[PDB]
Amino acid sequence: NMGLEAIIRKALM
Amino acid sequence: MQLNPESADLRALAKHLYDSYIKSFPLTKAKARAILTGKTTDKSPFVIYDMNSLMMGEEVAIRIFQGCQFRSVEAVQEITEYAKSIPGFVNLDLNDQVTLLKYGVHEIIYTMLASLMNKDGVLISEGQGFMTREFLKSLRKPFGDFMEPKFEFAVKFNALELDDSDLAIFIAVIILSGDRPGLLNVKPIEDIQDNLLQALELQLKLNHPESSQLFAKLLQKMTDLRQIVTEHVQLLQVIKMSLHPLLQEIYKDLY
Ligand SMILES: *c1ccc([N+](=O)[O-])cc1C(=O)Nc1ccc2oc(-c3cccc(C)c3)nc2c1
């Protein structure tokens, strides 16, 4: 769900 | 097989990926293996093999899971950083980048968990503890069934005797899977995976003269890894039972 997604988006930027 | 521009470009990719792996992952397989064979004076782990050694050494399930999932965040960041170094990855649609990592990280975590395991047990507290396999298996249901399939995977995986050079290409192959649910543009992902697969195949022929079907056996292991990830969902159901707080804390460092 969106937790992991968010950490990944943060990480990608 | 010949030495040519093609093969040289593939050896150059392998090197590029090995270097980015080394920058991205502080705990390598070489370092893990060194700890497990007692080379590192620095880290001589306490062995937890039974309830008594557990005491000397210092839903319950859902709480464990909440724990390990949040502790995975460092690994997720390292793998994400590693992915940025794969040629073509940052040129993919952002949503696909995210989808590839969302599915892939679990597989990579289990892959790198194998590095911390032998037949006897697994390193915990970043190199400082060693939890035995049979102790974990001894615990009351459902906890006793949590780690045993990862040890089964890890023993079979570690018997392939991959090194970090090998693992860096393997992990990249995993990240670039064109079959993940919800991908938008499958083709550019497959294009990258094709290139990484070629690099892996060459790497394995050069690095592993003992086993001429290692390439296939290693691809089959992606099936195994996918199964372990998928089994976590089925364990949520088996679960729907008290456990020593110190065992709870240890489980929060596994996956
Ligand atoms: C943490 C700590 C201990 C155990 N254990 O002993 O089995 C397990 C965990 C844990 O939560 N592991 C875990 C396994 C597999 C997972 O797959 C996901 C996941 C999340 C989001 C998207 C996908 C596709 C998969 N998370 C997992 C967590």
CA distance B115 to chain A (A): 24
Experimental technique used to determine this entry: X-ray
Q: Whose CA is nearest to atom 5 of ligand 1?
A: B255
Q: Does B101 touch chain A (CB under 8 A)?
A: yes
Q: Please choose from B63, B69, B151, B239 the residue to mutate so as to test ligand 1's pocket, defined by most ligand atoms within 8 A of CB.
A: B69
Number of CB pairs < 8 Å for A and B?
28
CA distance B16 to B169: 10
Characterize B192-202 residue by residue with b for buried, 16 or more Cβ atoms within 10 angstroms of its Cβ, and e for exposed: bbebbbbbbbb
Q: Whose CA is nearest to atom 4 of ligand 1?
A: B255
Q: How many helices (H) and strands (E) does chain B have?
A: 12, 3
Q: Please choose from B117, B139, B225, B232 the residue to mutate so as to test ligand 1's pocket, defined by most ligand atoms within 8 A of CB.
A: B232
Q: What is the DSSP letter of B128?
A: T
- What residues contact B154, with CB distance under 8 A and at least 6 apart? B113, B114, B117
Q: Report domain extents, chain B.
A: 1-255
Rg (CA), chain A: 6
Phi and psi at B122, nearest 5°, equal -140, 140
Burial of B243 (0-12, 13-18, 19+ CB in 10 A): middle
Beta bridge partners of B124: B129
CA distance B98 to chain A (A): 6
Q: Which amino acid is at B118?
A: N
Edge-to-edge order in the sheet of strand B121-124? B46-48, B129-132, B121-124
What's this structure's resolution in Å?
2.3
Measured N-to-C along each axis, helices B94-115 and B164-175 cross at an angle, to the nearest 10 degrees, of 150
